[PDB]
Every structure is written in structure tokens, then in C-alpha cells.
């Protein structure tokens, strides 16, 4: 996170860390949607262009963390992955359309004050909340600047940006499955995700029932906190049917 701030303890019980077994390193962000299901971006698991292609055995999932580097004893829970499910139509050759993937933990995790799942939106909540100017929140242990590492989990709240503006800021064909977000050059406020943040959750709090819903997934961006550029996120509700499908079927 660039231009963000230290998260409060317990602020994101659903935040998850994608940890590489060897070398022991931070790969991506993720979120806990159930006691056995973690949601993250697909590009985190597979991306031929950068020779990336991990399996269940290559990594660990770390839940309940606050500090990036320290193994938080008695607090955090590390689990193993049973099965990884990437979207059958993940366009990694072009625009990362449908940048989404599911992960099934080997054994359920137990919730605590630092570990709790986030809700997936329903059409209404999505309809009503996903509107330009409406602010969401991103979290992560990624880079503090485009070109260093924070000590604890960072947080930043960004406004959703008009579809026309998003399109006009990039050379990349953006699909209905994506939505960008961030401040405009003039708004005099900054903030954006960055390396090591992708995979993470972009949530919003419903003013109707007081719950937190994850509206997007940190997908891709060109640089970090650059003027006139915005971050793009996977439209989670738009692909909920695949999420339910996988969950139910498997």
C-alpha cells in the first residue's frame, strides 16, 4: 500500500497472506470467505509471462496476521492447501479478465478475535454500493512506494471511479469484470495498492446491515500511485456464480 496507514488490530480479520514455502516469502494477499475457503487473484497463482505457476504444495496460507515478518505465536494460524481452483476463462494473455481463484484449506480454521470471514455481495448490495465516488478499503503488506516494506498491515480507502475515466486512462481493454478505483490528479489525496498487495480484498461496509462485503480483488495496475492512473479490481459479484458453483460442487 502506497500512502496508506497502519491497520488497527482486528481491523481486517479476513485478511490473509499468501506465503511461499521456499524461499519463505510474501507472494500475495487473499481473503477468508469461509472456514475452509480463501479467495485470491489468479495471476497470483498462474502467469506464464513471468514464469509463475504454483501448486498446492508450493505455498502456505497465513491467517490472522498483523505484522508482516514476525511469526505471531498464539495469534496467527498457518494452513495447508488442499485444492486450487483458477477461473476456466482467466485471460492472462491479454487483460487478466476474470482474475479470480479459489483455495480450499486442508482443514478448517477456527475463528477468533483476529480471524473472521468476509461476506460475498448479493446483487442488491452490489447494485447499491458499487457507485462512483463511493469509497472502499484496501489492505496489505505490499510495497509502500512504486520503487519499502511496512512493518504491519497497511490500509487505505479509495473512491470508485467512473467507467469512462478508467478506460481513458489505459491502453488496456477493460472488461465488465473489472472496475478501477483511486483518486483523481486534482482531488489532492493519493493512495493505491502495489506489489505484494494484489490478491487482496477491496471491501465496503453496508450502511443497511452494518456488514463488510468484498466488492473486488486487487487485480492489476500500471505502476503505483501514479497521477491519472488507477488500480483495477476483479468485480467479485459478477463472478459469484462461479464461486458458488465451485464451492457447492467441490
Amino acid at each position: 500500500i502506497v500512502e496508506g496507514s497502519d491497520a488497527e488490530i482486528g481491523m481486517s480479520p479476513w485478511q490473509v497472506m499468501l506465503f511461499r514455502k521456499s524461499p519463505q516469502e510474501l507472494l500475495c494477499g487473499a481473503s477468508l470467505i469461509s472456514d475452509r475457503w480463501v479467495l485470491t487473484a489468479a495471476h497470483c497463482l498462474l502467469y506464464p509471462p513471468w514464469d509463475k505457476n504454483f501448486t498446492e504444495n508450493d505455498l502456505l496460507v497465513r491467517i490472522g496476521k498483523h505484522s508482516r515478518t514476525r511469526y505471531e505465536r498464539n495469534i496467527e494460524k498457518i494452513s495447508m492447501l488442499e485444492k486450487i481452483y483458477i477461473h476456466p476463462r482467466y485471460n492472462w494473455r491479454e487483460n487478466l479478465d476474470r482474475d479470480i481463484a479459489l483455495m480450499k484449506l486442508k482443514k478448517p480454521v477456527a475463528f477468533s478475535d483476529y480471524i473472521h470471514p468476509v461476506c460475498l455481495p448479493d446483487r442488491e448490495t452490489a447494485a447499491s454500493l458499487l457507485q462512483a465516488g463511493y469509497k472502499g478499503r484496501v489492505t496489505g503488506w505490499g510495497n509502500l512506494k512504486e520503487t519499502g516494506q511496512p512493518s504491519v498491515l497497511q490500509v487505505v480507502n479509495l473512491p470508485i471511479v467512473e467507467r469512462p475515466v478508467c478506460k481513458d486512462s489505459t491502453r488496456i481493454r477493460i472488461t465488465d469484470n473489472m472496475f478501477c478505483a483511486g483518486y483523481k490528479p486534482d482531488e489532492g489525496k493519493r493512495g493505491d495498492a502495489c506489489e505484494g498487495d494484489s490478491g487482496g480484498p477491496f471491501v465496503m461496509k453496508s450502511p443497511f446491515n452494518n456488514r463488510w462485503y468484498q466488492m473486488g480483488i486487487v487485480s492489476w495496475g500500471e505502476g503505483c500511485d501514479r497521477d491519472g492512473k488507477y488500480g483495477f479490481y476483479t468485480h467479485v459479484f459478477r463472478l459469484k456464480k462461479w464461486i458458488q458453483k465451485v464451492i457447492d460442487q467441490f
Binding site: G10, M11, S112, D113, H116, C119, K135, K205, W212
Partner: peptide
């Protein structure tokens, strides 16, 4: 999940985090 989206240290305690007001105020 039945109690999803509800944080044990905030909502369940009726406490607000430092900047969640910012979000709620953007929802016109």
C-alpha cells in the same frame, strides 16, 4: 457465513475503527 462481515473487535463490540466513517460518508 451467518455472522460474516462482523468484526469481533469492532462491530460485535459496537466500536468503530479509525476511518470507517470516511467510507459511510461517501455513500450518498
Amino acid at each position: 457465513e451467518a455472522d460474516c462481515g462482523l468484526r469481533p473487535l469492532f462491530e460485535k463490540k459496537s466500536l468503530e475503527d479509525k476511518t470507517e466513517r470516511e467510507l459511510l460518508e461517501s455513500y450518498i
